[PDB]
Amino acid sequence: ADTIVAVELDTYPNTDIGDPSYPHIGIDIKSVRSKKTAKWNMQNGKVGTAHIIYNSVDKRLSAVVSYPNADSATVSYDVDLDNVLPEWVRVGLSASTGLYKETNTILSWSFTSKLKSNSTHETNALHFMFNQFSKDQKDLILQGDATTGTDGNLELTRVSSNGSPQGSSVGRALFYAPVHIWESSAVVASFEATFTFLIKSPDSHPADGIAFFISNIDSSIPSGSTGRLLGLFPDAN
Amino acid sequence: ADTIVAVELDTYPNTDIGDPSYPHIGIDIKSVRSKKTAKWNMQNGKVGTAHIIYNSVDKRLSAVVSYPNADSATVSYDVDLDNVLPEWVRVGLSASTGLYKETNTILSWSFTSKLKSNSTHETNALHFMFNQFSKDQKDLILQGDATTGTDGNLELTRVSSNGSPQGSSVGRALFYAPVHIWESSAVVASFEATFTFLIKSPDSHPADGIAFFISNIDSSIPSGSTGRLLGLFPDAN
Ligand SMILES: [Ca+2]
Ligand SMILES: [Ca+2]
Ligand SMILES: [Zn+2]
Ligand SMILES: [Zn+2]
Ligand SMILES: [Zn+2]
Ligand SMILES: [Zn+2]
């Protein structure tokens, strides 16, 4: 089927599908039910930063979410991606609303992946950084209700003309070029992503969150994945 | 039509279409008839390196071709790309044979482009480096007779099973993601490419050469562009 490894910034607690009783950050390996979560002091109307790192030596995936003058929430998970993901992938950002709403605005996004093979510091590396999004972002595969150009930001889910979030929305943003995430003969494979966001809610119930994800090249928004499924999962298995 | 800016490493002199009476390096702006050339002491069976640089302040495009222990051939041309190329492009490597043949092997290839806008060192940057090509290079749009995996090299034009170049061949290799090459509000736009090659010929008449080029997103091998047209041009205008 569709393979998904993601780091979710889950703003709405769905105690029923395993979500902790509070807003959290988690590492989802093929399931909306995180393999590890951590309490995240979500701050409405603030600009946050998420950094995700992984290297094939420690075989550990970690994320750090922070706001200026707010302690960071950290979550790590031991996982060897050499066997949960295919050699070639695509990386993206996802977000969704459902019953409750919030803006899922991405202000910037960078990414680097490196494959140090056989010898020296000769590598295969891909790197991109967006500090501003063009209204005609030709290097981003936009999916669902995700758009760009609104002040140079990337809006992952439907927002109003006057400036107010719409619920029941789903939108992804995948980088155009496939990424060679791992390889048989690589001594060290590593990657690191960083992006800033602004999650603001009109009502006091913000929902449902942003997600950095690594999927197969051909991935598309799963059927009926709005609200709690973050635009990444078909069911809540 | 199809826009092409290229830096050719022309091994065969076609005096008739403007080529100097010897192997050269040139800067072609929309024409196979270079806007500036320079003598290049081509060396059969050797590994060479080409570096191309451009920045929007000097509005100058330059290239340097060199072999270890051989003087570099240099060619620069004043050209403002803000008006010969569209905002979004694709970058690639081209090569061709015709009546005469040679290998057009690419051993490695890197590229970086940067757009420093409004303020600080915040940018939009794309970077890639291939120090070895996979048999299933999913991030390279291969065209014509170009292939990968042969010892981790990229062969731009048809070669034999035993190891010997075939004439009348044309192949390009474009990076998958479109590159935002310039923009209206950018203080400094710049790029730099570097690639190593091995041009070896069985007979004493090597032909016809490799070319780094920047074209529109949708570009494809022009009809009947083998031999002297390097896989980039429809006619010899
Ligand atoms: Ca949730
Ligand atoms: Ca020629
Ligand atoms: Zn969750
Ligand atoms: Zn493994
Ligand atoms: Zn020429
Ligand atoms: Zn200009």
Side-chain angles (χ1 to χ4, degrees), chain B residues 87-144 146-150:
Chain B
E87 257 212 5
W88 291 86
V89 304
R90 259 206 168 86
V91 298
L93 289 186
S94 198
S96 69
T97 46
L99 181 61
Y100 296 113
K101 45 275 161 48
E102 61 177 18
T103 48
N104 294 98
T105 321
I106 292 296
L107 285 78
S108 70
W109 179 31
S110 54
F111 172 90
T112 305
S113 82
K114 297 207 252 82
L115 287 193
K116 332 242 193 182
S117 280
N118 210 18
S119 304
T120 330
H121 47 302
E122 47 78 61
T123 316
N124 273 25
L126 165 61
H127 169 60
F128 69 77
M129 187 187 288
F130 300 108
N131 258 276
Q132 203 211 347
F133 305 75
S134 311
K135 229 265 285 182
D136 192 12
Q137 204 62 57
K138 296 181 116 295
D139 53 2
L140 283 198
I141 287 182
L142 286 174
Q143 294 180 336
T147 63
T148 40
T150 298

Side-chain angles (χ1 to χ4, degrees), chain B residues 59 80 82-83:
Chain B
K59 293 183 193 297
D80 177 16
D82 290 13
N83 50 251

Side-chain angles (χ1 to χ4, degrees), chain A residues 88 90 122-132 134 136-139 175-178 180 217, chain B residues 88 90 122-132 134 136-139 175-178 180 217:
Chain A
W88 291 87
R90 262 205 166 86
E122 46 78 61
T123 316
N124 273 26
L126 165 60
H127 169 61
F128 67 77
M129 186 188 288
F130 300 108
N131 257 277
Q132 204 212 347
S134 310
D136 192 13
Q137 204 62 58
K138 296 182 115 295
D139 51 3
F175 183 58
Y176 207 91
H180 197 170
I217 293 172
Chain B
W88 291 86
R90 259 206 168 86
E122 47 78 61
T123 316
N124 273 25
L126 165 61
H127 169 60
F128 69 77
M129 187 187 288
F130 300 108
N131 258 276
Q132 203 211 347
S134 311
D136 192 12
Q137 204 62 57
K138 296 181 116 295
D139 53 2
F175 184 59
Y176 207 91
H180 197 172
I217 294 173

Side-chain angles (χ1 to χ4, degrees), chain A residues 8 10 19 24 34:
Chain A
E8 48 162 278
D10 201 337
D19 270 17
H24 50 287
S34 331

Side-chain angles (χ1 to χ4, degrees), chain B residues 6 13 25 32 60 131 146 211:
Chain B
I25 61 169
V32 68
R60 184 185 297 274
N131 258 276

